[PDB]
Structure formats: C-alpha cells, structure tokens
Paper text:
In this work, we diversified a de novo [name] barrel by extending multiple βα‐loops using constrained hallucination. For the diversification experiment, we used the de novo [name] barrel sTIM11‐SB as the base scaffold. This variant contains a stabilizing salt bridge cluster in the lower part of the β‐barrel (Kordes et al., 2022). Here, we introduced two or three helical insertions into minimal loops in the de novo designed [name] barrel sTIM11‐SB.
In the case of [name]‐1, the crystal structure shows all three intended hallucinated extensions in their entirety, verifying their successful incorporation into sTIM11‐SB. One minor deviation between [name]‐1 and the base scaffold is observed within the N‐terminal α‐helix of the barrel, as these residues do not form a continuous α‐helix. In the case of [name]‐1, the crystal has an uncommonly high solvent content of 78% (Matthews coefficient: 5.6), that may influence the quality of the data and in combination with a certain flexibility of the extensions, lead to the rather noisy diffraction data. These discrepancies are mainly due to the different angles of the extensions from the barrel core, especially for insertion 1 that does not form a continuous α‐helix. The theoretical scattering curve of the predicted structure shows a high χ 2 of 8.9, whereas the crystal structure matches the experimental data with a significantly lower χ 2 of 2.0, indicating that the crystal structure matches the protein in solution more closely. These pockets show differences in size with pocket volumes of 1006 Å3 in [name]‐1 and 2000 Å3 in HalluTIM2‐2.
Residue numbers in the entry: 7 to 268
The structure:
C-alpha cells in the first residue's frame, strides 16, 4: 500500500488484497482494499496441523483450545464484513470449505480451479503422448470437478461466484456454469520465464530478461483480451509484477489482485 497507490492513481476502482495473515489483512482493510481474498482451505490445513504441534510439543495451552483459535479466525474476518463496505472473498477447492465459508458469511465465493486445471492439462498432454484415450477422459474429469462446484453453487443460490484459473478456456467454461467473476492468475508464467533466463549461458544479461518476462506478460494479457471478446464483464488479474498488473487494467481487467510480494 506504500507502493500500490500507483495503481490507485490510474483507473483504480477495484483493488483486491490476497493474504491469510490477519495483520496484513487488517492493514489492507484500513488502507482501502476493496476486496480481501482469504483461503479457507489454507486456513484449514494450518488448523489441523496446529493442534498437531500441541500434541508434539508437550503443551496444554494449545490442546483443548484449538477450537477457540479456529473460531477466532472466522470472527475477526466476519467483524470486518460488518464494520465496512470492504468485501470478503473466501477461496477453496474443497466443497465443504465453500459451504462453511458461505455459512460463516462471504460476499464472494471463489471456486479455485488453478491446481486442478493444471493437473488436468498435464494429464491431457500425457495422454496425447501415450496415445491413450482413456487418460484423456480421466484428464477431463479433473476440470469438471471444479466446474461442478460452480454450477452447484449456482443451483443452491450463491450470489457472487468466482473462479480462478490461468487459461481463458477454463474460465469461459466456468462462466457458462455460473461463475460471474473470472480470475486470471499469471504468477506461474512469470516464474517460469524467470527460471529460464537463469538457465541461459548469460543469466546476468539484463537485456535478455526484459522481453522474456514481457512475453510471459503478453500471455497473461491474452487471457484477459480473449475473455473480453467472449463478453465477460468482471475480470480479475493476479500478478506479482508491477507492469503486468498495470497493463492488464487497460486490457479489460477491472479487478487487480495484489499481495505482500507487491
Ligand atoms: Cl489420443
Ligand atoms: Cl455468496
Ligand atoms: Cl484468488
Ligand atoms: Cl486449459
């Protein structure tokens, strides 16, 4: 936020902050974040392993009080929902976590299809390499596991359903299933692009990294441009690169997701 107001200077409107840390979430709330993105599944995994530490360390301050820690995490976020117009977006790939977040209170439910979409993509390509049509069908069911969560949330009456992926084809299909907010996550493309310049014979070449990271940016913006042609309205963009987020606003993304890395 000490360096995010540059995005607030141009266009602005909607800024989302992604974190599971309460201190950063509170500071983002006070700094004017329009949407807070909290991972209900990441908070659950840290919970089921917290009381596991209390069983290992030899301490009773943690055992029989872990249920108080979990409920406390829900309450501090729900209190933020009341005190302001800042929206709380809960994200998970797990159906029980989504219904729990809906019960606890959520303005946006984000069906996370990023990992499952990538696993389906690698299974499809692996099936093509093996010439196995059965593995093709296996790969397709890995994506429909996330689309079915979207359409079931639509059937039960969820108001604001979101979907996270890295590819416009998965997001368009989720959009047809009932998702209204399409989240493009471009962090992996920048990560892979930077990992490749480190493998070159001249990795310190400051000229050869500029366009390689740029090509990874155009691949992200291309997802936004194609979704804009299909007719999508609310498009969100996730990236840890400053130029990637700024230019994505001009491409058609009206929600920019920042985090502590920015
Ligand atoms: Cl095949
Ligand atoms: Cl909702
Ligand atoms: Cl997200
Ligand atoms: Cl895909």
């Amino acid at each position: 936020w000490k360096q995010v107001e540059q995005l607030r200077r141009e266009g602005a409107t909607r800024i989302a902050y992604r974190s599971d840390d309460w201190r950063d979430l509170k500071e983002a709330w006070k700094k004017g974040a329009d949407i807070l993105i909290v991972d209900a599944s990441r908070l659950r995994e840290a919970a089921d392993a917290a009381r596991a530490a209390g069983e290992a360390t030899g301490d009773e301050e943690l055992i029989a009080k872990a249920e108080a820690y979990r409920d406390e995490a829900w309450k501090q976020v729900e209190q933020l929902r009341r005190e302001g117009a800042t929206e709380i977006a809960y994200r998970s790939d797990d159906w029980r976590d989504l219904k729990e977040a809906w019960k606890k209170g959520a303005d946006i439910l984000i069906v996370d299809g990023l990992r499952r979409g990538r696993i389906a993509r690698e299974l499809e390509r692996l099936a093509k390499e093996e010439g196995d049509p059965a593995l093709l069908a296996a790969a397709e069911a890995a994506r429909e596991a996330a689309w079915k969560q979207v359409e079931q949330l639509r059937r039960e009456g969820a108001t604001r359903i979101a979907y996270r992926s890295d590819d416009w084809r998965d997001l368009k299909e989720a959009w047809k299933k009932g998702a209204d907010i399409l989240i493009v996550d471009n962090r992996a493309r920048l990560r892979r692009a930077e990992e490749e310049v480190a493998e070159t014979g001249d990795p310190d070449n400051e000229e050869l990294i500029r366009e390689t990271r740029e090509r990874a940016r155009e691949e992200g913006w291309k997802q936004v441009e194609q979704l804009r042609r299909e007719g999508a309205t609310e498009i969100a963009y996730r990236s840890d690169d400053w130029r990637d987020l700024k230019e994505a606003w001009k491409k058609g993304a009206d929600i920019l997701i920042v985090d502590a890395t920015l």
